[PDB]
Design a protein around this ligand. Structure first.
Ligand SMILES: *[C@@H]1O[C@H](CO)[C@@H](O[C@@H]2O[C@H](CO)[C@@H](O[C@@H]3O[C@H](CO[C@H]4O[C@H](CO[C@H]5O[C@H](CO)[C@@H](O)[C@H](O)[C@@H]5O)[C@@H](O)[C@H](O[C@H]5O[C@H](CO)[C@@H](O)[C@H](O)[C@@H]5O)[C@@H]4O)[C@@H](O)[C@H](O[C@H]4O[C@H](CO)[C@@H](O)[C@H](O)[C@@H]4O[C@H]4O[C@H](CO)[C@@H](O)[C@H](O)[C@@H]4O)[C@@H]3O)[C@H](O)[C@H]2NC(C)=O)[C@H](O)[C@H]1NC(C)=O
Ligand SMILES: *[C@@H]1O[C@H](CO)[C@@H](O[C@@H]2O[C@H](CO)[C@@H](O[C@@H]3O[C@H](CO[C@H]4O[C@H](CO[C@H]5O[C@H](CO)[C@@H](O)[C@H](O)[C@@H]5O)[C@@H](O)[C@H](O[C@H]5O[C@H](CO)[C@@H](O)[C@H](O)[C@@H]5O)[C@@H]4O)[C@@H](O)[C@H](O[C@H]4O[C@H](CO)[C@@H](O)[C@H](O)[C@@H]4O)[C@@H]3O)[C@H](O)[C@H]2NC(C)=O)[C@H](O)[C@H]1NC(C)=O
Ligand SMILES: *[C@@H]1O[C@H](CO)[C@@H](O[C@@H]2O[C@H](CO)[C@@H](O[C@@H]3O[C@H](CO[C@H]4O[C@H](CO)[C@@H](O)[C@H](O)[C@@H]4O)[C@@H](O)[C@H](O[C@H]4O[C@H](CO)[C@@H](O)[C@H](O)[C@@H]4O)[C@@H]3O)[C@H](O)[C@H]2NC(C)=O)[C@H](O)[C@H]1NC(C)=O
Ligand SMILES: *[C@@H]1O[C@H](CO)[C@@H](O[C@@H]2O[C@H](CO)[C@@H](O[C@@H]3O[C@H](CO)[C@@H](O)[C@H](O)[C@@H]3O)[C@H](O)[C@H]2NC(C)=O)[C@H](O)[C@H]1NC(C)=O
Ligand SMILES: *[C@@H]1O[C@H](CO)[C@@H](O[C@@H]2O[C@H](CO)[C@@H](O[C@@H]3O[C@H](CO)[C@@H](O)[C@H](O)[C@@H]3O)[C@H](O)[C@H]2NC(C)=O)[C@H](O)[C@H]1NC(C)=O
Ligand SMILES: *[C@@H]1O[C@H](CO)[C@@H](O[C@@H]2O[C@H](CO)[C@@H](O[C@@H]3O[C@H](CO)[C@@H](O)[C@H](O)[C@@H]3O)[C@H](O)[C@H]2NC(C)=O)[C@H](O)[C@H]1NC(C)=O
Ligand SMILES: *[C@@H]1O[C@H](CO)[C@@H](O[C@@H]2O[C@H](CO)[C@@H](O)[C@H](O)[C@H]2NC(C)=O)[C@H](O)[C@H]1NC(C)=O
Ligand SMILES: *[C@@H]1O[C@H](CO)[C@@H](O[C@@H]2O[C@H](CO)[C@@H](O)[C@H](O)[C@H]2NC(C)=O)[C@H](O)[C@H]1NC(C)=O
Ligand SMILES: *[C@@H]1O[C@H](CO)[C@@H](O[C@@H]2O[C@H](CO)[C@@H](O)[C@H](O)[C@H]2NC(C)=O)[C@H](O)[C@H]1NC(C)=O
Ligand SMILES: *[C@@H]1O[C@H](CO)[C@@H](O)[C@H](O)[C@H]1NC(C)=O
Ligand SMILES: *[C@@H]1O[C@H](CO)[C@@H](O)[C@H](O)[C@H]1NC(C)=O
Ligand SMILES: *[C@@H]1O[C@H](CO)[C@@H](O)[C@H](O)[C@H]1NC(C)=O
Ligand SMILES: *[C@@H]1O[C@H](CO)[C@@H](O)[C@H](O)[C@H]1NC(C)=O
Ligand SMILES: *[C@@H]1O[C@H](CO)[C@@H](O)[C@H](O)[C@H]1NC(C)=O
Ligand SMILES: *[C@@H]1O[C@H](CO)[C@@H](O)[C@H](O)[C@H]1NC(C)=O
Ligand SMILES: *[C@@H]1O[C@H](CO)[C@@H](O)[C@H](O)[C@H]1NC(C)=O
Ligand SMILES: *[C@@H]1O[C@H](CO)[C@@H](O)[C@H](O)[C@H]1NC(C)=O
Lengths: 116, 439, 116, 116, 45
């Protein structure tokens, strides 16, 4: 299909192609910038505990205030471009909640291991 | 219990560090602020509970970086500008008919290499030195024997713009919030910012202008208050307004030196010729001196506090230099520092204007400021003093202080004293009962 | 709280905020330096097998010479700033021991799979 | 032992030292280049699903045309330098096969996430 | 000796309108005769 070839497809269809898209003086600035973008995204995944995965489930419940749409209304009826606009104002809030959940999870894993 | 090493990441610790800082500013100025990163519309500051930290304004390397950046920006602004090397030519001068000005004439180059033109211009006596022939009629520009002279571009403003200093991610700037602080020792209230508050570049030699004010009381800062070699920085609670004027109405004329170049000079003065001057309100200044003396007495055993004018040295040392309207003023501050304070209208300061300057005192460098036409007026706040102690004396009766300081860095310190740069180290290890499971 | 807001808090209390600090020409130099700073610590985590984790337990036993302090004396009576100073002379030693232990674990898991 | 001190040792012996080598305008360009090389290798591990591991087993069968040597002939009779030369012309084939095997694994993981 | 020559030139001065006569010694290796080959005039090699 190729890079971004799924952009006009539904979110559910697009989720199949994530593997493909995970890949891929002024030159110096271009090289530094390319590195910063790669690491920016990886830093978030590492903090979330999602590193190494294209699809990562979390323990954060969905707030109906972020969207009142059913899963079918989202996965089979939307492009990711449309979806990002719908939650553009809630994305940072969601990110913080994921991070808090990861830290609570690892603290609990530690306390469990203390019993062994 | 058997304890094991556990790795933590994101640990809230830091160590003192020196890192490259970059400018940021609010969305042609000499400081090239357009090159700077736009400031955050809503800057963050985090108070650090239960944190006490050691600061030392005299060892602070933010100051060294600011000084290098101020010089580097200044030099960059002069690179495209017109060189005045052709102007180092014998000048023939007579009195304008005040002593501060001479009416000079000379032969200068033209757009065409084979042609010459006669130029009449007025110069300040400070920029003019007699030629060793000593006939009294022949003169040269004062820096022709030490440096090339470059004309500042007329399009470039020297007006200060606040500059925020920011640190790279992974580093942070700590700020001291104590109501009074000497810039040294432990600070009880510490907060963290990514960037400093904006700091205006200000160039001055005796008085600090338009700086931060003390919240409650006058703060006197020194690396060693008992060592007369050290420069004492005094921060005032309330500003004292100083107003400056250049009464002369200069008419600025322009003559081509050569292709792509032009020279700007005052060709005429409209109306009478009067000396430039600055005034400080007497009642407000007197209150300021008394309050400074009251604070000094707490360090010096309640000896009578004496202020005095500088003992000597270059004009740049003995007078108060500043940039007003793009003109460079040098003012006689003896009107401000003539008092004696026992334990028990306005002040007019004469000034001089000099077009050729050496702001960083570097050998081999000089700048010629172009004249700014018309009458120039300025207003600024005196927000602090640079004082030195007159030592070598064993007298227990009284103590004497004089204005001025050894370096430009002393000005930068007056705003940066509260800031410290630290490196954030997110890794750490500690013992826990937790043991890793192995497949 | 906020960035480093926990710095004066006890080591145990501070652990709830790990994600807060985990996230986050001269301008170009600043950008490159920030990348090198970030990667330095991530490289160690990758070697230690701790990548993607805020809290990572190891198989290295605590040597009492590094500190004789009880867990209460460390976790409920210290800041992380104080702790780093106490073991500043042993930090590199500890780091090497973690690396040696990880490499042996990687080898042992390989051998287990070879048998199975 | 020190950096690359294992280079003349047998591959099996060398495997115990992997963490030793895992560590570590012209100046600015050099710093960016060093980062790119580090990340180049880390991206390959992420593509292969091997990120965070010093030793990573794959599902790709050894293809005997690359080498006909027995494990004893490889692990105890050769250095890594000799081994790289022996299969130098096949390394790209191996890397591509590892990526293909990971792609199949990710498709299977996606189904499992929806099932449970 | 033969390796040196005593040369003179009109050098510029701190002031553009003034000139000074300068005497200096140069090594023969740094000095080239004028193309007229009269030996009375020289230039830097
Ligand atoms: C900066 O430094 C300072 C100094 O180091 C740090 O402060 C220290 O912080 C720790 C951690 O919070 C505090 O320890 C905790 O102390 C409480 C007990 O204190 C209580 O009793 C007070 C009694 O005084 C009156 O009020 C009671 C009301 O019933 C009356 O009966 C009395 O007669 C008196 O009138 C009471 O006043 C306190 O309430 C007030 O003060 C607290 C201070 O923290 C405020 O929050 C309140 O809002 C209020 O202003 C308070 O009730 C212990 O109870 C704590 O132990 C519990 O929590 C621990 C958290 O780690 C936990 O480990 C323990 O196991 C225990 O948890 C148990 O109880 C919980 C109750 O909710 C359960 O939920 C839990 O499951 C479990 O059962 C803890 O010991 C230090 O006292 C405090 N030191 C000082 C000198 O103040 C400060 O934190 C640092 N700042 C930062 C940012 O790091
Ligand atoms: C760009 O946007 C368009 C519009 O959104 C989008 O097209 C929609 O694609 C979705 C699938 O992603 C379609 O929904 C499915 O349709 C399945 C097939 O039903 C009919 O269409 C078949 C052909 O569809 C494919 O090929 C056409 C081009 O030919 C293409 O447009 C389609 O997108 C799709 O690729 C056709 O073969 C099939 O045949 C029937 O009718 C013929 C008539 O002659 C008859 O002879 C046959 O015997 C038979 O009766 C029929 O015509 C449908 O099976 C599928 O439901 C199954 O799969 C889903 C998903 O796994 C399961 O959930 C479900 O339970 C079933 O198992 C589903 O309904 C949708 O219909 C398209 N919309 C339109 C208007 O065509 C493109 O894909 C987008 N492009 C990209 C790149 O994203
Ligand atoms: C540079 O190159 C040289 C030559 O290759 C290397 O020297 C070899 O080092 C390896 C690893 O240490 C040696 O392998 C071991 O040799 C032992 C030799 O036996 C000792 O004891 C007998 C008497 O019982 C003596 O006669 C002999 O001289 C030795 O003192 C073997 O016993 C070992 O076998 C055991 O371990 C292996 C590996 O785990 C097991 O597979 C066996 O079943 C058994 O448990 C082992 O074979 C090798 O012999 C050395 N060669 C020589 C000629 O000495 C250097 O190590 C290398 N340097 C570097 C840095 O790589
Ligand atoms: C520093 O102080 C001097 C003295 O206070 C200020 O000069 C004063 O300026 C005012 C306004 O120009 C003068 O008023 C004028 O007086 C003349 C007569 O002298 C009169 O003819 C005009 O109509 C007008 O009334 C005032 O005389 C003058 N004082 C003196 C002694 O010359 C000066 O402005 C001060 N500088 C600053 C920066 O404030
Ligand atoms: C300083 O000197 C300059 C001249 O070098 C003075 O500028 C001149 O001022 C006169 C008025 O005094 C101007 O004439 C007026 O022009 C306006 C234009 O709208 C007109 O409406 C008036 O009727 C009158 O003609 C003259 O143009 C102006 N020259 C220039 C070049 O601008 C200046 O006023 C002096 N400043 C002071 C404080 O005296
Ligand atoms: C700033 O203004 C003050 C007041 O007009 C000037 O004060 C005068 O300064 C000169 C030295 O530059 C003093 O001359 C000295 O007198 C002492 C004896 O008192 C003698 O020992 C020295 O060798 C020298 O002759 C002069 O007395 C003093 N005038 C007054 C009334 O105190 C000051 O010079 C001005 N500063 C500058 C940089 O122009
Ligand atoms: C601060 O200033 C005082 C006064 O200059 C310094 O005290 C001098 O210290 C030297 C040390 O050799 C003694 O020989 C002098 O006799 C001391 N002077 C007096 C007047 O006591 C002090 O050293 C300075 N502090 C620092 C840190 O430089
Ligand atoms: C410093 O103070 C002295 C006085 O101690 C000033 O000299 C006075 O000048 C005024 C005005 O001419 C006279 O009325 C006084 O009588 C003078 N005093 C003496 C003792 O002669 C001197 O002008 C002051 N300096 C400055 C810069 O203001
Ligand atoms: C500060 O005190 C010194 C020392 O007393 C003063 O210098 C003295 O001045 C008196 C004037 O009568 C003389 O009698 C003394 O002989 C002087 N002492 C020395 C050591 O020379 C100085 O004048 C005082 N300063 C002020 C502003 O009053
Ligand atoms: C949903 O969002 C609203 C608004 O931010 C918030 O007040 C509410 O607590 C949220 N619900 C949940 C379950 O987080
Ligand atoms: C001009 O002033 C100077 C002193 O500054 C003096 O020597 C000269 O003779 C004066 N010229 C006239 C014409 O008075
Ligand atoms: C200012 O101070 C001087 C002493 O230095 C004093 O004589 C004068 O009265 C003061 N002026 C006012 C208005 O208080
Ligand atoms: C100087 O002081 C006055 C006091 O009213 C104040 O209004 C003004 O803003 C101050 N100027 C600066 C540059 O701080
Ligand atoms: C514990 O640490 C001390 C100091 O580094 C060291 O001498 C000692 O050998 C260590 N003990 C062990 C078992 O490593
Ligand atoms: C093994 O490698 C050879 C050479 O590339 C290739 O022809 C052969 O098909 C490969 N075998 C398998 C099973 O992939
Ligand atoms: C091991 O490899 C070396 C280098 O190729 C070779 O000389 C030696 O004969 C091999 N040993 C065996 C048993 O094949
Ligand atoms: C210097 O100038 C004079 C004329 O003023 C000329 O005669 C002489 O030859 C010149 N010297 C040189 C070395 O050109």
């Amino acid at each position: 299909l190729g890079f971004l070839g799924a952009a006009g497809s539904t979110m559910g269809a697009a989720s199949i192609t994530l593997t493909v898209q995970a890949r891929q003086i002024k030159q110096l600035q271009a090289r530094v910038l390319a590195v910063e973008h790669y690491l920016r995204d990886q830093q978030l995944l590492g903090i979330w505990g999602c590193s190494g995965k294209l699809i990562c489930c979390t323990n954060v419940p969905w707030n109906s205030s972020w969207s009142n749409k059913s899963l079918d209304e989202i996965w089979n009826n939307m492009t990711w471009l449309q979806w990002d606009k719908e939650i553009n104002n809630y994305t940072q809030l969601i990110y913080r909640l994921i991070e808090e959940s990861q830290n609570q999870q690892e603290k609990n894993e530690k306390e469990l291991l203390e019993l062994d | 219990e058997n304890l094991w090493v556990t790795v933590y990441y994101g640990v809230p610790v830091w160590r003192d560090a020196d890192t490259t800082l970059f400018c940021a500013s609010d969305a042609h100025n000499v400081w090239a602020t357009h090159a700077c990163v736009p400031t955050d519309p809503n800057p963050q500051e985090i108070h650090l509970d239960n944190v006490t930290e050691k600061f030392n304004m005299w060892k602070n390397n933010m100051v060294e970086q600011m000084h290098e950046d101020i010089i580097s920006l200044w030099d960059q602004s002069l690179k495209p500008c017109v060189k005045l090397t052709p102007l180092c030519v014998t000048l023939h001068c007579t009195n304008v008919t005040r002593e501060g000005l001479k009416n000079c004439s000379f032969n200068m180059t033209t757009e065409l290499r084979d042609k010459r033109q006669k130029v009449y211009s007025l110069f300040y006596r400070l920029d003019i030195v007699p030629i060793n022939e000593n006939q009294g009629s022949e003169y040269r520009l004062i820096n022709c024997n030490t440096s090339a002279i470059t004309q500042a571009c007329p399009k470039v403003s020297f007006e200060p713009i606040p500059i925020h200093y920011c640190t790279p991610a992974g580093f942070a700037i700590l700020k001291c919030k104590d109501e009074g602080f000497n810039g040294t020792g432990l600070c009880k209230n510490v907060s963290t910012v990514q960037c400093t508050h904006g700091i205006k570049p200000v160039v001055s030699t005796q008085l600090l202008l338009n700086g931060s004010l003390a919240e409650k009381n006058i703060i006197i800062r020194s690396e060693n208050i008992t060592n007369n070699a050290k420069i004492i920085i005094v921060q005032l609670v309330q500003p004292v307004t100083i107003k400056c004027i250049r009464p002369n109405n200069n008419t600025v004329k322009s003559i081509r030196i050569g292709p792509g170049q032009a020279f700007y000079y005052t060709g005429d003065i409209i109306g009478d010729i009067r000396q430039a001057h600055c005034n400080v309100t007497r009642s407000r200044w007197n209150k300021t001196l008394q309050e400074v003396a009251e604070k000094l007495r707490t360090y010096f055993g309640n000896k009578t506090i004496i202020f005095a004018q500088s003992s000597g040295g270059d004009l740049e040392i003995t007078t108060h230099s500043f940039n007003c309207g793009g003109e460079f003023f040098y003012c006689n501050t003896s009107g401000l520092f003539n008092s004696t304070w026992y334990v028990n209208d306005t002040i007019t300061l004469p000034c001089r204007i000099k077009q050729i300057i050496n702001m960083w005192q570097r050998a081999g460098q000089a700048m010629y400021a172009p004249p700014i036409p018309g009458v120039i007026k300025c207003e600024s706040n005196i927000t602090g003093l640079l004082l030195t102690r007159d030592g070598g004396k064993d007298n227990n009766v009284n103590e004497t202080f004089r204005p001025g300081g050894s370096d430009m860095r002393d000005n930068w310190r007056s705003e940066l004293y509260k800031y410290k740069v630290v490196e954030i180290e997110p890794l750490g290890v500690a013992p826990t009962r937790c043991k890793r499971r192995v497949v």
